[PDB]
Amino acid sequence: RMKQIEDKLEEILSKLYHIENXARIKKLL
Amino acid sequence: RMKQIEDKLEEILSKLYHIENXARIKKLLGE
Amino acid sequence: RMKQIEDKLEEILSKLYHIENXARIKKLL
Amino acid sequence: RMKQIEDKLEEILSKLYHIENXARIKKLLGE
C-alpha cells in the first residue's frame, strides 16, 4: 500500500507534466 | 489515515482527468 | 509527518481546483 | 520511503506553481 502510493504520486506528476506540455487547447490550435 | 490518503490520491487523479479533458477555456469556446 | 502529508495532498487538490476555475488565461481574457 | 514521498509532494507543488503561472499558451502569446 505504501508503493501504490509512491506510484500514484509519480503518476500525478506525470499527468501534470503532460497537462503542462490540454485536450481542448490542442484542438483549438 | 492511510485510506484517507489513498482516497485523496484518487480524487487528485480524477481532478487531473477533468483538467486534461479548464472552466474559462470551455467558456471561451462554448463547450 | 503523516499529517504534513495529508495536508500537502489537500493543498495539491486545492491548487488543482483553482487552476481549473490560469494566470495567463485570466490575463489574455 | 517516507522522505521520497515527501520529496515527490514538493515536486508536485512546484509543478503546480509553474502551471498556475502552460507551454502551448505561452507559445501562443509569445512569452
DSSP B1-31: -HHHHHHHHHHHHHHHHHHHH-HHHHHHHT-
CA distance D27 to chain B (A): 16
Shortest distance, CA B21 to any CA of chain D (angstroms): 15
Residue type at A13 in one-letter notation: L
Give, in order, the Cα–Cα distances in Å from B9 to each of A2, A6, D19, D20, D28. Answer: 12, 10, 19, 20, 32
Smallest Cβ distance to D13: which of C1, C8, C19? Answer: C8
Distances (CA, A) of B31 to A2, B19, C1, D7, D21: 40, 14, 42, 38, 24
Final resolution, Å: 2.2
List the grid coordinates of A23.
485536450
Contact between A16 and D15 (Cβ < 8 Å): yes
Method by which the coordinates were obtained:
X-ray
Per CB-CB distance under 8 Å, the chain C contacts of A25 are 22
Q: Considering all CA atoms of chain B, what is the largest pairwise distance in Å, rounded to the nearest integer?
A: 41
Q: What is the 3-state secondary structure (H, E, C) of A1-29?
A: CHHHHHHHHHHHHHHHHHHHCCHHHHHHC
Domain spans of chain D, in order of start:
1-31
C-alpha cell at C16: 488543482
- Residues of A near D (Cβ–Cβ under 8 Å) read 2, 5-6, 9-10, 12-13, 16-17, 19-22, 25-26, 29
Closest CA to C15 of D18, D2, B27: D18
For C1-29, where are the alpha helices, taking DSSP H only?
2-20, 23-28
Q: Is A25 within 8 Å of C25 when comparing Cβ atoms? A: no
- Give, in order, the Cα–Cα distances in Å from D27 to each of A21, B2, B21, B28, D16: 11, 41, 20, 18, 19
Report the distance separating Cα A14 and Cα D19, nearest Å: 13
